[PDB]
Amino acid sequence: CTYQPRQYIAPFDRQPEGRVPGIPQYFASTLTLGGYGTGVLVRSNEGRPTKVEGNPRHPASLGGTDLFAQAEILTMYDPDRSTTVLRQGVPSTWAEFTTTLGNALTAARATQGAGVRLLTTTITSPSLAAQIEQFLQAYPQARWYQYEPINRDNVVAGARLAFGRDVTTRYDLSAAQVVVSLDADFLAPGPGFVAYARAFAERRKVRKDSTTMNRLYVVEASPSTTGTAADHRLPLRADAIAAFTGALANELGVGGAPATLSPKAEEFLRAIARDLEEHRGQSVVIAGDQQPPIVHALAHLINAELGNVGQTVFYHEPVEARPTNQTEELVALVSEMAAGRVETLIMIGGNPVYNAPGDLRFADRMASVPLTIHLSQFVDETSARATWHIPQAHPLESWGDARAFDGTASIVQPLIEPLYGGKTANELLAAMLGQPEAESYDLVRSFWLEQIGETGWQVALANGVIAETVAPVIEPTLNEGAIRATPIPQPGDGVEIVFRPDPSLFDGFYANNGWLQELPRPLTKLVWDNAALMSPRTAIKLLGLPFNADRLIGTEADDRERQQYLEQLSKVNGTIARIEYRGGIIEIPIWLLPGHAEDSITLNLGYGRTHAGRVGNNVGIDVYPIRTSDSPWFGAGARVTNTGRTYLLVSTQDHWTLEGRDIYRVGEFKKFKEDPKYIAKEVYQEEYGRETPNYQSLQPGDDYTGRNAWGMTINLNACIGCNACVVACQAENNIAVVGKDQVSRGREMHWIRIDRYFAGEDLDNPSIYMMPVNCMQCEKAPCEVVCPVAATVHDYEGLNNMVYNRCVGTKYCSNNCPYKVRRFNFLQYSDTTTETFKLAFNPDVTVRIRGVMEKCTYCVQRISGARIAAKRAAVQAGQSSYVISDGAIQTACEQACPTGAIVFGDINDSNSRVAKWKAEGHNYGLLGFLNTVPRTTYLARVRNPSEELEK
Amino acid sequence: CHQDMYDQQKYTTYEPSSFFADGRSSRPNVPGTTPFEVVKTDEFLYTGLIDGQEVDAMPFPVTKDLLLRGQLKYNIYCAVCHGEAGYGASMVAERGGIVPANFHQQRLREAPLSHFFVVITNGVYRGDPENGGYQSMYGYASRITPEDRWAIAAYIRALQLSQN
Amino acid sequence: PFTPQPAPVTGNTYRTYVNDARTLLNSYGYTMEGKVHIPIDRAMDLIVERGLPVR
Amino acid sequence: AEAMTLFAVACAGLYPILHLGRPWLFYWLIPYPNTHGMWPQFRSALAWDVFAISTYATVSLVFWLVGLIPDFATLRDRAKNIWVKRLYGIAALGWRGSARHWHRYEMASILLAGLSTPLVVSVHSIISLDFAISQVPGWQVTVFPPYFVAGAVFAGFAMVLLLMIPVRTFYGFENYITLHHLDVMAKVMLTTGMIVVYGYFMEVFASLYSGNEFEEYLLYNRLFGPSSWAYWGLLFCNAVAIQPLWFKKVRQNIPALLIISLIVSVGMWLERYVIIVISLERDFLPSSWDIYIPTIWDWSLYIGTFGLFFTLLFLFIRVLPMINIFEMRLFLYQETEKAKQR
Amino acid sequence: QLHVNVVGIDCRYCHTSVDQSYFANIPATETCMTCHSQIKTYSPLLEKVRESYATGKPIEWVKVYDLPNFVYFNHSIHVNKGIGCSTCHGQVNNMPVVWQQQALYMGWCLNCHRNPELYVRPREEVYNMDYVPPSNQLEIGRQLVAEYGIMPPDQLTNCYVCHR
Numbered sequence A: 001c002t003y004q005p006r007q008y009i010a011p012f013d014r015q016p017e018g019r020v021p022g023i024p025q026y027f028a029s030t031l032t033l034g035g036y037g038t039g040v041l042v043r044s045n046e047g048r049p050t051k052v053e054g055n056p057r058h059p060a061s062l063g064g065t066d067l068f069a070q071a072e073i074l075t076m077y078d079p080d081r082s083t084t085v086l087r088q089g090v091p092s093t094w095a096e097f098t099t100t101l102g103n104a105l106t107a108a109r110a111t112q113g114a115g116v117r118l119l120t121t122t123i124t125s126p127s128l129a130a131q132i133e134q135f136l137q138a139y140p141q142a143r144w145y146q147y148e149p150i151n152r153d154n155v156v157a158g159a160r161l162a163f164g165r166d167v168t169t170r171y172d173l174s175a176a177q178v179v180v181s182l183d184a185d186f187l188a189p190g191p192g193f194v195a196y197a198r199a200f201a202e203r204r205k206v207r208k209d210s211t212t213m214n215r216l217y218v219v220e221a222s223p224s225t226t227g228t229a230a231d232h233r234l235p236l237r238a239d240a241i242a243a244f245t246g247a248l249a250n251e252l253g254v255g256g257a258p259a260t261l262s263p264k265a266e267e268f269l270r271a272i273a274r275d276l277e278e279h280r281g282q283s284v285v286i287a288g289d290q291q292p293p294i295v296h297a298l299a300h301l302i303n304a305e306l307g308n309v310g311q312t313v314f315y316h317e318p319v320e321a322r323p324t325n326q327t328e329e330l331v332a333l334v335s336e337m338a339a340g341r342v343e344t345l346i347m348i349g350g351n352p353v354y355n356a357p358g359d360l361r362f363a364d365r366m367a368s369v370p371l372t373i374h375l376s377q378f379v380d381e382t383s384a385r386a387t388w389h390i391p392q393a394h395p396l397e398s399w400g401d402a403r404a405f406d407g408t409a410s411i412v413q414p415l416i417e418p419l420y421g422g423k424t425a426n427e428l429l430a431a432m433l434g435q436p437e438a439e440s441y442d443l444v445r446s447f448w449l450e451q452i453g454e455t456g457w458q459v460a461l462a463n464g465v466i467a468e469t470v471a472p473v474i475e476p477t478l479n480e481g482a483i484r485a486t487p488i489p490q491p492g493d494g495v496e497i498v499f500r501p502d503p504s505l506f507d508g509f510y511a512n513n514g515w516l517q518e519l520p521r522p523l524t525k526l527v528w529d530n531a532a533l534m535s536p537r538t539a540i541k542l543l544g545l546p547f548n549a550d551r552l553i554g555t556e557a558d559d560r561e562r563q564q565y566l567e568q569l570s571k572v573n574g575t576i577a578r579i580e581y582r583g584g585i586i587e588i589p590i591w592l593l594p595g596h597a598e599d600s601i602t603l604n605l606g607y608g609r610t611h612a613g614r615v616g617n618n619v620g621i622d623v624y625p626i627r628t629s630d631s632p633w634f635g636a637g638a639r640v641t642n643t644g645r646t647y648l649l650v651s652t653q654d655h656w657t658l659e660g661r662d663i664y665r666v667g668e669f670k671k672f673k674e675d676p677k678y679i680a681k682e683v684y685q686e687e688y689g690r691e692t693p694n695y696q697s698l699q700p701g702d703d704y705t706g707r708n709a710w711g712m713t714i715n716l717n718a719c720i721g722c723n724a725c726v727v728a729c730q731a732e733n734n735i736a737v738v739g740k741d742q743v744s745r746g747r748e749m750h751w752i753r754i755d756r757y758f759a760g761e762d763l764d765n766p767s768i769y770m771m772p773v774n775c776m777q778c779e780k781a782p783c784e785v786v787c788p789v790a791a792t793v794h795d796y797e798g799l800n801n802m803v804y805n806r807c808v809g810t811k812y813c814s815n816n817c818p819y820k821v822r823r824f825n826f827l828q829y830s831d832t833t834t835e836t837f838k839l840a841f842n843p844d845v846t847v848r849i850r851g852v853m854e855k856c857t858y859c860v861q862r863i864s865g866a867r868i869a870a871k872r873a874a875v876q877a878g879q880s881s882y883v884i885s886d887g888a889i890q891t892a893c894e895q896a897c898p899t900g901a902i903v904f905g906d907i908n909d910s911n912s913r914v915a916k917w918k919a920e921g922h923n924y925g926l927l928g929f930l931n932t933v934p935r936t937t938y939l940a941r942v943r944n945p946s947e948e949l950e951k
Numbered sequence B: 001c002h003q004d005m006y007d008q009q010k011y012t013t014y015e016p017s018s019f020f021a022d023g024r025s026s027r028p029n030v031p032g033t034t035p036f037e038v039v040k041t042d043e044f045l046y047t048g049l050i051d052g053q054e055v056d057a058m059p060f061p062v063t064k065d066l067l068l069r070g071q072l073k074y075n076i077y078c079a080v081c082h083g084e085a086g087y088g089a090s091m092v093a094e095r096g097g098i099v100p101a102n103f104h105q106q107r108l109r110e111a112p113l114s115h116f117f118v119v120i121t122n123g124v125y126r127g128d129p130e131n132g133g134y135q136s137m138y139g140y141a142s143r144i145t146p147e148d149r150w151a152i153a154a155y156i157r158a159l160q161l162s163q164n
Numbered sequence C: 001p002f003t004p005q006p007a008p009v010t011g012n013t014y015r016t017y018v019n020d021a022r023t024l025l026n027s028y029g030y031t032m033e034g035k036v037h038i039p040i041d042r043a044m045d046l047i048v049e050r051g052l053p054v055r
Numbered sequence D: 001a002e003a004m005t006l007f008a009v010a011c012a013g014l015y016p017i018l019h020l021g022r023p024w025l026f027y028w029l030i031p032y033p034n035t036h037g038m039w040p041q042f043r044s045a046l047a048w049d050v051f052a053i054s055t056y057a058t059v060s061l062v063f064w065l066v067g068l069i070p071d072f073a074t075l076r077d078r079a080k081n082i083w084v085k086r087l088y089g090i091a092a093l094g095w096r097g098s099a100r101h102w103h104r105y106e107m108a109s110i111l112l113a114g115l116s117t118p119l120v121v122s123v124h125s126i127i128s129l130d131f132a133i134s135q136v137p138g139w140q141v142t143v144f145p146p147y148f149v150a151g152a153v154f155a156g157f158a159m160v161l162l163l164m165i166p167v168r169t170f171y172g173f174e175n176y177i178t179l180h181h182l183d184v185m186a187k188v189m190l191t192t193g194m195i196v197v198y199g200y201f202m203e204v205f206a207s208l209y210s211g212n213e214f215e216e217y218l219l220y221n222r223l224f225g226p227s228s229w230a231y232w233g234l235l236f237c238n239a240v241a242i243q244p245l246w247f248k249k250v251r252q253n254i255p256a257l258l259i260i261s262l263i264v265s266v267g268m269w270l271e272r273y274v275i276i277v278i279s280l281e282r283d284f285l286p287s288s289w290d291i292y293i294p295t296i297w298d299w300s301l302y303i304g305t306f307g308l309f310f311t312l313l314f315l316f317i318r319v320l321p322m323i324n325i326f327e328m329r330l331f332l333y334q335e336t337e338k339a340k341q342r
Numbered sequence E: 001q002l003h004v005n006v007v008g009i010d011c012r013y014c015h016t017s018v019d020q021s022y023f024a025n026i027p028a029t030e031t032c033m034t035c036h037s038q039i040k041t042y043s044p045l046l047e048k049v050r051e052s053y054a055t056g057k058p059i060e061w062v063k064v065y066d067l068p069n070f071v072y073f074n075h076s077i078h079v080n081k082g083i084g085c086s087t088c089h090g091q092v093n094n095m096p097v098v099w100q101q102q103a104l105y106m107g108w109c110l111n112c113h114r115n116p117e118l119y120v121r122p123r124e125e126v127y128n129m130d131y132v133p134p135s136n137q138l139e140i141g142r143q144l145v146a147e148y149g150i151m152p153p154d155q156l157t158n159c160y161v162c163h164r
């Protein structure tokens, strides 16, 4: 036996031109969530996509991405993505499909085109929309009929009600000092999420020299990242937000209904109304996509009269090709299916059978057509139901384009030839237009040439932005008479069912995504499952559980007793409740959401699938049959009845409160302006009786006086809890996906966790405290002292060196870690057999085997790469001393943070941003009484409350 | 005996793979793509053709450091066959039938710099459809960055001044 | 397994060509048809001084 | 008792290698020459555990074999078959019972006792230290080395009584292992259990005396946590069950001693559960809180190490004497001399 | 041995990425056929090379110097910081078939990471296979360490220098 096997090597037959072997290469592509593309810098290691970063030249990117764009790598490398053309489940040929499609359309060319239809998602692609217009001009009796379940139909109808025309409303939050969100979850992924979060956090970040901060007001049923990052939150029912907006309009002076509300709601109303009419052009009122068009038009009227047009809100030309009511188009399409007037049906993406509301009976209406065409990257429920399923190329391997939330039309650049073949929607429409075997690259180049030119195409492909495709600003005329001539619907009596996109699976497209299913959800920390999220008071009043829920209300005298009572209120999560909403039964387990509104239940869309992959095959319980086309986001009356049968719902936290400890430090803005050290002064005055702690250690440590000392600073004031840093860390560092059973055993693998904490003076509606906890890389590391083989040691640079080749189990590093950031490979968690996951693995980070410990390394792949680059530049210039710049190292969490809460840099360099943030008075480290000297310090959350509401 | 993380599941730079048809995890360039902030608008920078003819020019002015880089890249990639002095006398031409072109002849003395860039990037005449054909110079687009190819052409001009 | 001892090269090598070219590229001299050599680190300086055509 | 020590150390030396996670790399904790130039840290307490467990097993086996060598001579003399003479002959090494050899033997036994007393105190102090050098609030407790010494002597004499009593009643050893032997072994049980009760009082005093929220929550978690069954059963099995051992009739009673020894063994397992699992369950950050639920496989491994211990013990009582043949005839000579001295 | 000591091909002609990335380039069949389109064609020992470049199938060479994938060697910084190929790979210019000159031990790596002055060379004698260290070599090794700014053994013996 030898030390190693033979280990054959495989070079190229022809070397690539612009590639140096071993140097990772960055390509500017575009990834779409709901049709609105965002610019991404996807890293090609050896001709294949491995890590998605942000494009700083791109409007909705700004260098940071969201969790869906971060997990698009594993969505691409899903092993259950479709490989062949399926005629009736049997494999077929694309050429034979195009022959049959040409025969079907030349049989349908006897008429003008009445039998041929279409069903796409929200299309912002200009080339693809031009091809749809060409197909509609060729067949004038064909219709577009686009639909996606998470859409902006209500925003489109609100714009049409307010202005009489379709506009795109983009918000400038850098110039906004008061933000009002009427169920507007703009700090969650969607149109313009990264730009909105970046501008909001840039205004939110406060220093010694800072004089102003922004204030956020939210009304919502489901607490979210937006309600987490809000100074004030009022939990109304989701159908009462219309009456809230009417009362706000009436007290602001514009047309609205003087609705009657709770005393807390009218106090929050007058707090908003007093904070407004004091920032004219420095305020913004945002309405959610789930809110009715009357709420959208009323927010438009409030922003118009408040002077916010041209300063914080902006009205542009519509960017989503043809704006329409997608749910009404789907109702018209299934009415045509029931009438039998449809013969040819073509779909691109969407998964309409799974994603349609259950009152339309999409499968039964679809079974009557003669032939169907589907294209959705998977053999989904619809593709299994349809004839003629064609695999769709991933955006990371497909040519195309996509407009942003403000309009950019950015080119979707592939980083690889498609693994399984498969055609794009441009190729499908080229084959539909009598041009088979056409290249999507040639199609998008033919569209973009003679529109921006060859030099414009080359500039746009090198960059990620076309400079001449921005939506121009317009001045639409507000129609206050049409706003006033509205029914203004009131909230309905009974239990309402609020339909919500999932934070991890979105609408269920990411259902097989292992990173997104294994990822703990915001506000609930759930994994691999769906739940009926509700308030504890609602759970008691509905299921009759033997508790009080008035024992969560109190003060700091009985705060620990209230936290113990919340721990007793826990565990009950998982009780399966039979919910009869409108002729349909879901029978979903419940989960306690303390921030949630009373008499409401939120069910996350995107679960209960049947034709997903091996990962997430039957996770969760489906909500789409319960969902109706009349109210696709709200509910009126639901029979939620407890039916025993407690299900195993798995969380990664299992304790929800801060047990009287100085971990999440909260301050106010005015006392921060007076003295920025008062948070730490009050904490150490209550703990020790002195303003400063005289922490004394018996260990000297190392020096760090003339060397590159690396540290992290996490801003708790500018963290929303979007888990994009966690998905980026998983993608960069090859963290394994463990099972739901392995998380239930307590063995989740995440180098960074976002710790929600529910601290407040009433636990039936607390404040949400999200904080990223990774390895602090402690200078005096209790994990390092207890390692018997020196598998974890400390650097000259100041990093704890978790060596996996050396780690021999013994699991003591994790017991001496006070933050428990270290994750152990108890079993063979990393996949060894899936070639797609093997391609998804980062070549520059090791893949851990069973029996070793792993934790956060400050992305030492990037640290070592920048150090090697700096030393190589130093000896090539003869400087005899390497200098690493402040922006030279950017970790994965810092890059993919859309807010910029995480900053990485040098400690000993005083001009670095981390040293400037650590020179602030509200910077602190966790558990300083343990003499660890953490290098990942935290900036205390500084709130900005209003005197009419809190002070 | 250990064999734990010695040959990992991740794919290394030139690791073979059974997933792809050519048996290689290293993937070629997608036809028609460019990296981030690597612009290709200067046609003279990436090929020697402007209007269908030779140019005899340079996209950037000559520098002593550029000429030293061109000398280094000439000694690495071009002096194996053409020789260090550029007279076409080398062990490759001695052992085989290469016989490369002398830079100090009249045809290469009055040859354009754009023609030098074209012959580095692409090479010479390929296989003709009539009476056969073959390629000899073979082109060096994949191995040499185009700025370094222009530096090689500048060093070719320097060697032509050296031997005249 | 001892360190292997390869057979030495008993024929003509590239070293004669390289040494002859480096001798011809230095210490000036005359060719068979031309006027005079200009050595390396001199003709490059003349090329830099006289410039090259641009665009 | 020394055979039980050797077999218990044999059962407990597999547990590092068994729990190690990469079991074949136990030798990386040992200072051994390698091509890497790597060393064990030696600042961790698990390297001290390597040295302490290796020294404890080696010196215990050496002292047991030294105490067996004239018993090997006695068995070699008392054997009948000529081929089992050489089985104990090569282990006795020709002992001869010489008075010159007895002087060196007694000096070596005295020095081995005076080296093995601080050896065993240091071994159980180091096994205390592999929690006590950590910053865990249930583990950063400085009375752990004498507390673990007392708990080990407590559980050890519980197991010793629980295995003398069937040996005494099934072999004819009532003349050798006596009611006075059981009485004094239960007296040492009562003393060391009182020291462990004092250690419980020290931990409770530290939690109440400290203003530290983590010590206060350690006491709260032990008293009223999800794993408070271990603490309450521990208090019953190590405090309530030892107050009968003050009484002379209960100390002399055999089935009461068996019940008390079994209860003490169960409560000492509960003590080690309370020290390790409850302190690791709830830590500084409340987000990193979870419950430890043991599976069927570590229970199966526990039952299996019980079987390995009893297999080694039954092999020992088959091929070797349970009690020392010499030093008990020397004890008889000493009692005869005491009777002659009146 | 033939291709360097006889033909005279520079090491960067075939290992093109050795001074720029961590991975020294295993050459392509395009790089081989650049000369072997004319020299020794229709030969059974170049039959495998001619079998490649017509299909996409590569030449499956065997990795002589195989590091166990948690080690992360970087060729570029080692070459640019004055460590020649002969001090770490041996006289590959005289190797007919490449052998491993030494085992790539962690201790052997740390020997030069702790005492680099015994093995550092002028950064311009790295590709020279004829270079031998001088009679003393310690004074000029300390001089070159100070000249190139080579880090102390604490920095070079840090775990995350190599492992990851």
Ligand SMILES: CCCCCCCCCCCCCCC(=O)OC(COC(=O)CCCCCCCCCCCC(C)C)COC(=O)CCCCCCCCCCCC(C)C
Binding pocket: D110, D111, D113, D114, D115, D116, D117, D118, D119, D121, D122
């Ligand atoms: C924090 C670290 C503390 C260090 C502790 C050191 C204690 C080690 C003592 C070993 C026992 C030897 C006594 C022999 C003997 O039986 O003495 C006889 C007299 O006969 C003789 O002439 C002596 C025979 C040879 C003695 C040489 C000993 C070799 C050196 C030991 C190597 C250790 C290293 C560190 C140098 C009569 O005397 C006695 O019997 C008295 C025995 C007293 C037992 C002590 C019990 C204390 C238990 C606490 C243990 C503390 C922990 C930290 C280990």
Ligand code: HEC
Binding pocket: B074, B077, B078, B079, B080, B081, B082, B092, B098, B099, B100, B101, B108, B116, B119, B120, B124, B136, B137, B140, B152, B156, E034, E035
């Ligand atoms: C040996 C394999 C060669 C190497 C290395 C390079 N070239 Fe070459 N080159 C070679 C041959 C056999 C020929 C002549 C081909 C023919 O059919 O006659 C050439 C040609 C040139 C020319 C002249 C082109 C012409 O006159 O039309 C030039 C200017 C030239 N080669 C330059 C050149 C440079 C700069 C190289 C390094 C990148 C180079 N060659 C490599 C053989 C070989």
Ligand code: HEC
Binding pocket: E011, E015, E018, E022, E023, E024, E025, E026, E065, E066, E067, E073, E075, E078, E079, E083, E084, E085, E086, E087, E088, E089, E104, E126, E127
């Ligand atoms: C000692 C510090 C070295 C020097 C100087 C050079 N190489 Fe290297 N080489 C070295 C090691 C330890 C390895 C194994 C790396 C691995 O991951 O397996 C290698 C490997 C190569 C290879 C194989 C391909 C690769 O791994 O990059 C080649 C082709 C190679 N080395 C060639 C090479 C040349 C030509 C060098 C001088 C410029 C050179 N290496 C420098 C050790 C060292």
Ligand code: HEC
Binding pocket: B080, B091, B092, B095, B096, E002, E003, E007, E009, E014, E027, E028, E031, E032, E033, E034, E035, E036, E039, E040, E043, E045, E046, E049
């Ligand atoms: C041009 C500079 C070459 C490159 C690049 C490669 N080889 Fe070569 N090879 C070349 C010559 C001039 C010779 C000797 C010819 C002679 O008559 O002695 C060789 C030799 C070989 C051989 C031996 C063939 C034989 O002796 O019949 C083989 C098998 C060979 N070369 C393979 C080879 C490969 C695989 C290469 C790419 C890494 C390669 N050579 C490069 C010229 C050149």
Ligand code: HEC
Binding pocket: E003, E004, E009, E010, E011, E012, E013, E014, E015, E026, E027, E061, E062, E063, E064, E065, E066, E085, E086, E089, E092, E093, E097, E098, E129
């Ligand atoms: C192209 C004609 C080459 C030149 C010039 C040099 N090497 Fe090379 N190298 C080449 C090939 C085709 C291979 C793989 C096949 C093999 O025989 O190993 C290599 C490999 C090496 C290695 C082995 C690395 C490994 O696979 O583990 C070493 C150590 C190496 N090359 C070093 C090296 C040096 C120092 C060179 C200049 C004198 C050199 N090679 C020239 C192709 C070519």
Ligand code: HEC
Binding pocket: A864, A867, A868, A871, E071, E072, E073, E074, E077, E078, E081, E083, E087, E088, E104, E105, E108, E109, E110, E112, E113, E116, E119, E148, E149, E150, E151, E161, E162
């Ligand atoms: C002497 C011949 C060496 C041997 C054997 C190895 N390395 Fe090396 N290494 C050497 C030098 C002179 C340097 C320069 C660094 C400096 O500051 O001067 C390095 C550095 C590295 C690095 C760069 C990391 C950093 O500088 O922060 C890496 C990644 C590295 N060495 C890896 C490495 C490995 C894995 C080795 C064993 C196969 C190894 N080196 C051996 C010199 C020498």
Ligand code: HEC
Binding pocket: A790, A791, A793, A803, A805, A806, B002, B003, B004, D035, D036, D038, E068, E071, E104, E105, E106, E109, E110, E113, E156, E157, E158, E159, E160, E161, E162, E163
């Ligand atoms: C680069 C100069 C290294 C540094 C710094 C460290 N190690 Fe290393 N490690 C390196 C090499 C070249 C090897 C392979 C050794 C071989 O014989 O092939 C290793 C390997 C190890 C191992 C052995 C792994 C195994 O056999 O499974 C261990 C246990 C190891 N390295 C640990 C280790 C630690 C803890 C280090 C920091 C103090 C460390 N190594 C430094 C290269 C380098």
Ligand SMILES: CCCCCCCc1cc(O)c2ccccc2[n+]1[O-]
Binding pocket: A810, D013, D016, D017, D020, D026, D029, D030, D046, D047, D049, D050, D053, D054, D130
């Ligand atoms: C060759 C003797 C080595 C056997 C003992 C190993 C030491 C050792 C190793 C470990 O990983 C431990 C983890 C927890 C508790 C004790 C431990 N001990 O003692």
Ligand code: SF4
Binding pocket: A718, A719, A720, A721, A722, A723, A724, A725, A726, A754, A772, A893, A896, A897, A898, A899, A900, A901, A902
């Ligand atoms: S730190 Fe992580 S959770 Fe917080 S905002 Fe940034 S990406 Fe989201």
Ligand code: SF4
Binding pocket: A774, A775, A776, A777, A778, A781, A782, A783, A784, A800, A816, A817, A818, A819, A820, A821, A822, A855, A932
């Ligand atoms: S945060 Fe935990 S793992 Fe990181 S250095 Fe500190 S104790 Fe070790």
Ligand code: SF4
Binding pocket: A725, A728, A729, A730, A732, A733, A751, A752, A774, A775, A856, A857, A858, A859, A860, A891, A892, A893, A894
């Ligand atoms: S710095 Fe890098 S390794 Fe550390 S938690 Fe963030 S992404 Fe993960």
Ligand code: F3S
Binding pocket: A786, A787, A788, A789, A791, A792, A807, A808, A809, A810, A811, A812, A813, A814, A852, A853
């Ligand atoms: S204690 Fe040490 S041996 Fe590994 S599991 Fe932890 S780094």
